Amino acid sequence: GGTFQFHSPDGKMEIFYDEADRQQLPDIGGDSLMEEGTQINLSDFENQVVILNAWGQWCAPCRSESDDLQIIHEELQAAGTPGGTVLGINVRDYSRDIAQDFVTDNGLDYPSIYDPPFMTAASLGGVPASVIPTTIVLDKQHRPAAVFLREVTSKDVLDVALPLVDE
Ligand SMILES: [Ca+2]
Ligand SMILES: [Ca+2]
């Protein structure tokens, strides 16, 4: 129940979408990583910027990204009620306990969906499921404003995300 279609035919690892070119996602959701049996959906964060981030503890680039994602989350929470959030999608981590301990050991404060088979990839309009990490910045209407198919820094994400909070 969405319209977003992803394309990057020039091999570029970051794509930005002007306001007029933005498309809608379905109400992406799944089981909470930290609270089994409780759903998290985009509609829980209405009017907030959302930084979706696909990650696994098994993934070296995800581990280097972890600190920057925490900074991004803290800055968005303080921006603007919270201005925005990071929302992780935990993938290919087939032991929930291992993923939870990663989150706790690294002091990560943002919520994640527990999605071992990356089912949510079907809703991301053709972003390949093999690209981990992927970060997608959603505007306040939860439309993709930027897609990063690589490890990101807090600087590059907030450059996009912070102006979106104020619009
Ligand atoms: Ca709910
Ligand atoms: Ca969680």
From TrEMBL:
<dbReference type="GO" id="GO:0016209">
    <property type="term" value="F:antioxidant activity"/>
</dbReference>
<keyword id="KW-1015">Disulfide bond</keyword>
<dbReference type="GO" id="GO:0030313">
    <property type="term" value="C:cell envelope"/>
</dbReference>
<keyword id="KW-0735">Signal-anchor</keyword>
<dbReference type="GO" id="GO:0016853">
    <property type="term" value="F:isomerase activity"/>
</dbReference>
<keyword id="KW-0732">Signal</keyword>
<keyword id="KW-0201">Cytochrome c-type biogenesis</keyword>
<dbReference type="GO" id="GO:0016491">
    <property type="term" value="F:oxidoreductase activity"/>
</dbReference>
<keyword id="KW-0676">Redox-active center</keyword>
<protein>
    <submittedName>
        <fullName>Thiol-disulfide isomerase and thioredoxins</fullName>
    </submittedName>
</protein>
<keyword id="KW-0812">Transmembrane</keyword>
<dbReference type="GO" id="GO:0017004">
    <property type="term" value="P:cytochrome complex assembly"/>
</dbReference>
<feature type="domain" description="Thioredoxin">
    <location>
        <begin position="14"/>
        <end position="167"/>
    </location>
</feature>
<keyword id="KW-0413">Isomerase</keyword>
